[PDB]
């Protein structure tokens, strides 16, 4: 009979378990025997207090490095403001020790936990690359609660070394099964930011994770976009509870908040899932998340049913992670077929955008060829366009099965005249659909201004397989 943790703050970890059903169903995974034994997670952030009384028992120097100062020791830099507390907070969400009379517990409270000190300094492309590519045959899961500025006007993603680190990680990492990269979708909600304008979250190689408040609402900081895959609980208003974790100076906090807290909880759940099946590939893990995540009682005004019967939202992806369902489904999971990529260059000539542009194209999705896709995973609309005020654009992509993905909502602060230079807007919302047939791209001016520009390239990139589908939900 499984005994739940006795830690003093565990009763305050409302998001891990409860009679109420407003939780990530983590205790159900624990009771199946999965607590993270043997799995290694690294927090890429401002350091990790490796001697914290609730982290020391799980700390893994092999999962750690200090890229900012070029040494092995990721100990945070102590300051009066406690600026460098952030990574320690994230770490405790994943792997705080259980049943030791201290604070609460991590989701994967028997996993090994490290940290890469890489934000406390100038974060160059090389710094990111060295962090994402750290010990990729030892570290299983990387968690990143950082990214490009959420001012609602930035378009920015991995530069060359960091993109190379993503491809190397998913290709050769974890014994060729692929590094698991978990990303926080962002805090730009107040600025009306779009997490599709963030190349890290918009990458197919990252599981981009959004947030729900305790009462099931879209938090003030949440960014909506089509690249988000799923959700975990985090903070909300001041009547709603927050996240309990290890804090700097060997303390315990009950007020960890924001997008920063959602990715580590997902990384913990993924750690339990990897314990249940160590043979899972980086793509396997995304399939599990899609199939098992739960929309129920998450409030949003944009829930839509996609072509295979799954509910999907731009605020939440496929919904809240469900640890018990993840670990259960992982155990007899059949590895997915190798990933195919079908490149479709859509345009025969540039197109003036004006007030509204619609581009319709019927595709065969590489019919007759080895990269024929009948079972979509990610899809990208790689767009090259000029426009005089970028943030007045709204961009939608409709799949042959009728699923309307918002690739870009209006960004009122985005005054840029730089347009988009082969920006690979990504959607997860047509996962498992057949991508053969008519695709529709809509670009519109959401303002009354007389804006002007031209779409010069539209590449539809489809990823997926040609086998193994489930009967739609």
């Amino acid at each position: 009979v499984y005994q739940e943790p006795t830690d003093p703050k565990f009763p305050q970890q409302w998001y891990l378990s409860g009679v109420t059903q407003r939780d990530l169903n983590v205790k159900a995974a624990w009771a199946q025997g999965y607590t993270g034994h043997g799995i290694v997670v690294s927090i890429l952030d401002d350091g990790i207090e490796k001697n914290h009384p609730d982290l020391a028992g799980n700390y893994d120097p092999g999962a750690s490095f200090d890229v900012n100062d070029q040494d092995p020791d990721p100990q945070p830099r102590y300051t009066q403001m406690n600026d460098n507390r952030h990574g320690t907070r994230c770490a405790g969400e994943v792997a705080a020790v259980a049943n030791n009379g201290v604070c609460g517990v991590g989701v994967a409270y028997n996993a090994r936990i490290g940290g890469v000190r890489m934000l406390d300094g100038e974060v160059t492309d090389a710094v990111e690359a060295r962090s994402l590519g750290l010990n990729p045959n030892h570290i299983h899961i990387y968690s990143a609660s950082w990214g490009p500025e959420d001012d609602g006007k930035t378009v920015d993603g991995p530069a060359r070394l960091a993109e190379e680190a993503f491809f190397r990680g998913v290709s050769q990492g974890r014994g060729g099964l692929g590094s698991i990269f978990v990303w926080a979708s962002g805090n730009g909600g107040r600025e009306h930011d779009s997490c599709n304008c963030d190349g890290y979250t918009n990458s197919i190689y990252t599981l981009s994770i959004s947030s729900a408040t305790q009462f099931g609402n879209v938090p003030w900081y949440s960014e909506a976009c089509s690249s988000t895959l799923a959700t975990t609980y985090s903070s909300g208003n001041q009547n709603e509870k927050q996240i309990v974790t290890t804090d700097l100076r060997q303390k315990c906090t009950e007020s960890h908040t924001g997008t920063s807290a959602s990715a580590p909880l997902a990384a913990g759940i993924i750690a339990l899932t990897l314990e249940a099946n160590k043979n899972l590939t980086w793509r396997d893990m995304q399939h599990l998340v899609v199939q098992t995540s739960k929309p129920a009682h998450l409030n949003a005004n944009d829930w839509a049913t996609n072509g295979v019967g799954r509910k999907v939202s731009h605020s939440y992806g496929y919904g809240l992670l469900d640890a018990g369902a993840m670990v259960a489904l992982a155990q007899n999971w059949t590895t997915v077929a190798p990933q195919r990529k079908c490149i479709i260059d859509i345009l025969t000539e540039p197109k003036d955008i004006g007030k509204r542009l619609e581009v319709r194209k019927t595709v065969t999705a590489c019919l007759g060829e080895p990269n024929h896709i009948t079972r979509l995973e990610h899809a990208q609309a790689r767009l090259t366009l000029s426009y005089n005020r970028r943030g007045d654009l709204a961009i939608h992509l409709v799949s042959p099965m009728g699923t309307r993905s918002t690739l870009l909502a209006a960004r009122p602060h985005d005054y840029s005249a730089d347009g988009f230079n082969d920006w690979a807007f990504m959607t997860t919302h047509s996962w498992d659909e057949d991508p053969s047939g008519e695709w529709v791209l809509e670009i519109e001016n959401t303002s009354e201004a007389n804006n002007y520009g031209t779409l010069t390239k539209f590449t539809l990139v489809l990823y997926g397989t040609a086998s193994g589908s489930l009967v739609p939900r």
């Binding site: 952030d45 401002d46 952030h86 934000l119 974060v123 990111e128 609660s145 950082w146 990214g147 490009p148 500025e149 959420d150 920015d156 920063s260």
Partner: peptide, 4 residues
């Protein structure tokens, strides 16, 4: 940039 890169913000926490």
């Amino acid at each position: 940039x890169x913000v926490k």
